[PDB]
Amino acid sequence: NQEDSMIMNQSSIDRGLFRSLFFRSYMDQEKKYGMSITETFEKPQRTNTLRMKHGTYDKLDDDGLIAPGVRVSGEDVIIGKTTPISSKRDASTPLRSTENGIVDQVLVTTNQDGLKFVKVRVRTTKIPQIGDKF
Amino acid sequence: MIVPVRCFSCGKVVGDKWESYLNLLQEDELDEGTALSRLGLKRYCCRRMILTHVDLIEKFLRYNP
Amino acid sequence: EEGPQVKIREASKDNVDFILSNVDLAMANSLRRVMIAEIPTLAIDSVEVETNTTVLADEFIAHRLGLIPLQSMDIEQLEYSRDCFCEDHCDKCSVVLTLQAFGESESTTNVYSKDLVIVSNLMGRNIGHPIIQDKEGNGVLICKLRKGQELKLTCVAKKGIAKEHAKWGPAAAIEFEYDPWNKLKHTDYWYEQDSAKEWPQSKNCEYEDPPNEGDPFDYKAQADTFYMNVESVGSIPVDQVVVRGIDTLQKKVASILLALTQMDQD
Amino acid sequence: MNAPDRFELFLLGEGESKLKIDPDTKAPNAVVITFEKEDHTLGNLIRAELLNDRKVLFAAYKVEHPFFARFKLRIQTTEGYDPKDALKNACNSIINKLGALKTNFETEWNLQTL
Amino acid sequence: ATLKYICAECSSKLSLSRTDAVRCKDCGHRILLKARTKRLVQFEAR
Ligand SMILES: [Zn+2]
Ligand SMILES: [Zn+2]
Ligand SMILES: [Zn+2]
């Protein structure tokens, strides 16, 4: 504990003291351009769709978004959408490289303009680490 | 949120006491400190684990979903 | 009687308050370090959540589940999760416990520690009973359910140590004193006018005759006579707490002897 | 994120044996023992019961880093006395003290009521 | 059993159709949620 710093009881941290719930609420929508060409939420195909992310989509379900029970980490994609061309290309929404946790829930609801629109809540228990600011 | 199960430092099991706590003031008309004395909560590190906390989960329960 | 001498002044199901006599200072500190940090016990190391609809996120609930005081009286028969050979756990590795509850009434039904249900084989061992000390008959309160919610999961209690995590620690609440008047002069008493009147004397003074103050300081003195009280958590009673600490200490010490005699090679 | 797994503190990892013996240069007959996965619980008692021995000269234990789990124990004894034998004698003294204490405490316990 | 999408106002189990709008018949609102996969979490209770 040096120059305005402190030392914490490791057991109390493990007992649960000063533990945190940390949520993230990602959002996306499709149908932006109109004229019946339209982005589609789906598990993509790697063939002829060359805009794929570093993370693979084995975690993706059939309609392109994962259930509220799947532990996630790294760059594992959460929402896979495809934008058409005049074949399809990726517009998937990966996860932030640093964070990791559990998908808390997934919400779909249309917009006022009639656009398909999704909000994914991810959750993590963040424990008091060493260099956290208190 | 929820009642802490054990005091964060001196380790005593404190989860079971909470409910009795609420009744201990109600029917017998006692102060908080004496009701904490009844449950063997001598050490104030333990003794601070209950009183400091308010059971907020009740407010969560009212919501239907 | 051949060395360390112990007098007991009071004891109970939860507490044992006693004098320890005629040992080196460091030994008691190491022994309480052992029982606080080294005694093996049993608690949850994995929870397979089936379905949850309660307010609480099952990370929280898993943490609460780890802290349940599980009786580990005969646990020395049990083998560690890591040491044993079952694939990730079996009846020799672990004790599985189911859990399920629903909203019976509009009146909120709470889930006590009691409603845990043992699944795994026991083969006669007294391991896995979540001990409960409350008068009403139900211990740790884990969650509350309104009429709508449902909570079902399956925890897998494993053997562990207080060093790795704090669940596997059986006392954590032990007193310690060894000098009523600082006759060893180990501390320097902060004071405003007088050290004594501004300092409450220890309640353990009645057994050790107070200094007559006529005598100069005794340089050759050392610390031998200790006063302390051990508090049970319920996983292991105090009697087996201290003895299992002593046994783990002897075993750790002797592990050095074994690795040493092995160190002598061809 | 970056923390060592909690089992790294009491269980010896890959290629890490329990003890090591290194004779100390620039010194008389003296040795450092490089413990592994050992807190001060053990070392402070080994040092104390070692110091109670008359024949030993130098006995110390230092925590190189409480970050990690190892502490180094150095000992030097008069010539003709292998220090490892001094360690063995101190350890056995500790063990017999512990056993007698255990039986003493059990005798004191069984008589007690409530 | 199988339950593909649910809604907030009433916890109605509704497997939903492809190329369909987002509307719960019994609730009446347009908000809906996804439901837990059958693969169950492994939790270091820690
Ligand atoms: Zn406490
Ligand atoms: Zn097994
Ligand atoms: Zn509904």
DSSP secondary structure string for all residues of B26-46: HHH---HHHHHHHTT--SHHH
Cα gap C227→C206, rounded to integer Å: 12
Mark which of C166, C196, C222 sits at the end of a domain.
C166
Please provide residue D75's backbone torsions phi and psi, each rounded to the nearest 5 degrees.
-140, 140
Q: End-to-end CA distance of chain E: give it in Å, rounded.
A: 31
Cα gap C69→C172, rounded to integer Å: 13
Closest-CA residue of chain D to A10: D6
Q: At what angle do helices D83-111 and D40-52 cross, to 10 degrees?
A: 110
Please provide residue D113's backbone torsions phi and psi, each rounded to the nearest 5 degrees.
-120, 155
CB neighbours (10 Å) of residue C185? 12
Determine whether A4 is an active site residue.
yes
Cα gap C98→C106, rounded to integer Å: 25
Interacting residues of E16 by C-beta distance below 8 A, sequence separation 6+: E4, E5, E32
Do C211 and C179 lie in a common domain? yes
Interacting residues of C158 by C-beta distance below 8 A, sequence separation 6+: C42, C43, C44, C45, C46, C81, C89, C93, C94, C95
CATH class as words, domain A20-127: mainly beta
Q: Which residues pair with residue C70 across a beta bridge?
A: C130
Confirm if C171 and C35 have CB atoms less than 8 A apart.
yes
DSSP structure string for A28-78:
EE---SBTTB--EES---STT-----SS-STT--TTSB--TT-EEETT--S
Place of tokens 């005598």: C215
**Adjacency order of strands within the sheet including C15-21:** C5-11, C15-21, C226-231
Take residue A38 and report the two structure tokens written for it.
Answer: 């339209």
Q: Quick one: how far is CA A125 from the chain centroid?
A: 16
Mark which of C126, C148, C166 sits at the end of a domain.
C166
Nearest CA among C174, C230, C232 for reference residue C41: C232
C63/E45 touch (CB, cutoff 8 Å), yes or no: yes
Confirm if D35 and D72 have CB atoms less than 8 A apart.
yes
Catalytic residue among A4, A62, A113, A132: A4
**CB of B65 within 8 Å of any CB in chain E?**
yes
- Greatest distance between any 2 Cα atoms in chain D: 61
Structural domain of residue C20, as residue ranges? 1-40+167-266
**CB of C59 within 8 Å of any CB in chain B?**
no
Which chains does A contact via 3+ CB–CB distances below 8 A? Answer: B, C, D, E
C-alpha B17 – ligand 1 centre gap (Å) = 13
**CB of E38 within 8 Å of any CB in chain C?**
no
Do C139 and C178 lie in a common domain? no
Give how far Cα A17 sits from Cα of A128, B46, B52, C33, Å: 9, 13, 13, 22
Q: Quick one: how far is CA C84 from the chain centroid?
A: 24
C165/E46 touch (CB, cutoff 8 Å), yes or no: yes
Q: Which residues of A touch C172 (CB under 8 A)?
A: 11
Do C6 and C28 lie in a common domain? yes
The residue type at C214 = G
Do C62 and C97 lie in a common domain? yes
SS3 at position A9? coil
| Shortest Cα–Cα distance, A7 to chain E (Å) | 21
Mark which of C109, C136, C166 sits at the end of a domain.
C166
Cα gap B34→D39, rounded to integer Å: 41
Residue D73 CB burial class (10 angstroms; 0-12, 13-18, ≥19): buried
C abuts E (3+ Cβ pairs < 8 Å): yes
| Shortest Cα–Cα distance, A1 to chain E (Å) | 26
Total structural domains within chain C = 2
Query: How wide is the angle at C-alpha A54 spanned by C-alphas A51 and A60, nearest 5°?
Result: 85
Confirm if A44 and A82 have CB atoms less than 8 A apart.
yes
A15/C60 touch (CB, cutoff 8 Å), yes or no: no
Nearest CA among C173, B44, C37, C63 for reference residue A18: C63
Beta pairing, strands A20-29 & A40-41? unpaired
Where do the structural domains in chain B lie, given as residue ranges? 1-65
Residue B51 CB-half CA count within 13 A:
16
Residue C129 CB burial class (10 angstroms; 0-12, 13-18, ≥19): middle
E strands of chain D, at which residues? 21-23, 30-34, 56-62, 72-77
Beta pairing, strands C15-21 & C5-11? antiparallel
Cα gap C3→B58, rounded to integer Å: 57
Closest-CA residue of chain B to E6: B65
Take residue A74 and report the two structure tokens written for it.
Answer: 């790294």
Cα gap D102→C243, rounded to integer Å: 6
C-alpha C235 – ligand 1 centre gap (Å) = 17
C-alpha E29 – ligand 3 centre gap (Å) = 8
The residue type at C257 = L
**CB of A14 within 8 Å of any CB in chain C?**
yes
Take residue C253 and report the two structure tokens written for it.
Answer: 């010490």
Confirm if C155 and C97 have CB atoms less than 8 A apart.
yes
Q: Which residues of C touch D96 (CB under 8 A)?
A: 3
Residue C4 CB burial class (10 angstroms; 0-12, 13-18, ≥19): buried
| Shortest Cα–Cα distance, B15 to chain C (Å) | 5
Closest-CA residue of chain A to B8: A12
Contacts with A, D 2-31, CB within 8 Å: 2-3
Please provide residue A63's backbone torsions phi and psi, each rounded to the nearest 5 degrees.
-95, 5
A125/C60 touch (CB, cutoff 8 Å), yes or no: yes
Do C50 and C19 lie in a common domain? no
Give how far Cα A74 sits from Cα of A70, A97, A100, C114, Å: 13, 5, 6, 39
Nearest CA among C173, C237, C203 for reference residue C9: C203
Total structural domains within chain D = 1
Cα gap A55→A46, rounded to integer Å: 12
Cα gap C7→B36, rounded to integer Å: 31
The residue type at B9 = S
Take residue C15 and report the two structure tokens written for it.
Answer: 């507490």
Q: Which residues of A touch D7 (CB under 8 A)?
A: none
D98/C249 touch (CB, cutoff 8 Å), yes or no: yes
- A14 labeled binding residue: no
Q: At what angle do helices C25-37 and C238-263 cross, to 10 degrees?
A: 100
Closest-CA residue of chain D to A11: D6
D abuts B (3+ Cβ pairs < 8 Å): no
Do C127 and C149 lie in a common domain? yes
Nearest CA among D24, D22, D5 for reference residue D13: D5
SS3 at position E19? coil
**Adjacency order of strands within the sheet including A88-90:** A40-41, A81-84, A88-90
Q: Which residues of D touch C82 (CB under 8 A)?
A: 7, 11
C29/D44 touch (CB, cutoff 8 Å), yes or no: yes
What experiment produced this structure? Answer: X-ray
Confirm if A65 and A78 have CB atoms less than 8 A apart.
yes
Buried b (16+ CB within 10 A) or exposed e, B16-37: bbbbebeebeeeeeeeeeebbe
Nearest CA among A112, A24, A122, A10 for reference residue A65: A122
**CB of D1 within 8 Å of any CB in chain A?**
yes
Confirm if A102 and C59 have CB atoms less than 8 A apart.
yes
SS3 at position E27? coil
Place of tokens 């009844």: B38
Closest-CA residue of chain B to C70: B13
Give how far Cα C250 sits from Cα of A32, B49, C193, D92, D101, Å: 72, 35, 48, 9, 12
- C205 labeled binding residue: no
Please report which ligand is nearest the Cα atom of B47: 1
Nearest CA among C164, C191, C173, C177 for reference residue C225: C177
| Shortest Cα–Cα distance, B65 to chain E (Å) | 6
C-alpha C81 – ligand 2 centre gap (Å) = 6
The residue type at C153 = L
SS3 at position D94? helix
Helices (H) and strands (E) in chain E, counts: 0, 2
Cα gap E9→C28, rounded to integer Å: 61
Element (H, E) at A83: strand A81-84
Cα gap C27→D90, rounded to integer Å: 13
Cα gap A48→A56, rounded to integer Å: 16
Cα gap A56→C208, rounded to integer Å: 74
Take residue C9 and report the two structure tokens written for it.
Answer: 């002044």
Do C123 and C203 lie in a common domain? no
Structural domain of residue D104, as residue ranges? 1-114
Nearest CA among C220, C240, C223 for reference residue C232: C240
Cα gap C66→C73, rounded to integer Å: 18
SS (H, E, C) chain C: CCCCEEEEEEECCCEEEEEEECCCHHHHHHHHHHHHHCCEEEEEEEEEEEEECCCCCHHHHHHHHHCCCEEECCCCCCCCCCCCCCCCCCCCCEEEEEEEEECCCCCCEEEEHHHCEECCCCCCCCEEEECCCCCCCCCCEEEEECCCCEEEEEEEEEEEECCCCCCCCCCCCCCCECCCCCCCCCCCCCCCCCCCCCCCCCHHHHHCCCCCCCCCCCCCCCCCCEEEEEECCCCCCHHHHHHHHHHHHHHHHHHHHHHHHHHCCC
D105/C243 touch (CB, cutoff 8 Å), yes or no: yes
Interacting residues of C261 by C-beta distance below 8 A, sequence separation 6+: none
| Shortest Cα–Cα distance, D84 to chain A (Å) | 35
Cα gap C37→C33, rounded to integer Å: 6
Cα gap C204→A120, rounded to integer Å: 61
Cα gap C236→C14, rounded to integer Å: 10
CB neighbours (10 Å) of residue C49? 22
**CB of A115 within 8 Å of any CB in chain E?**
no
Q: At what angle do helices C238-263 and D83-111 cross, to 10 degrees?
A: 160
Nearest CA among D37, D52, D82, D51 for reference residue D60: D51
Take residue A18 and report the two structure tokens written for it.
Answer: 């000063």
Please provide residue D37's backbone torsions phi and psi, each rounded to the nearest 5 degrees.
55, 50
Q: Which residues of C touch E44 (CB under 8 A)?
A: 45-46
Deposited resolution, Å: 3.9
Take residue B10 and report the two structure tokens written for it.
Answer: 């001196």
The residue type at B55 = D
Nearest 10 degrees: CA dihedral of C214, C215, C217, C223? -110
Residue C71 CB-half CA count within 13 A:
15
| Shortest Cα–Cα distance, C187 to chain D (Å) | 20
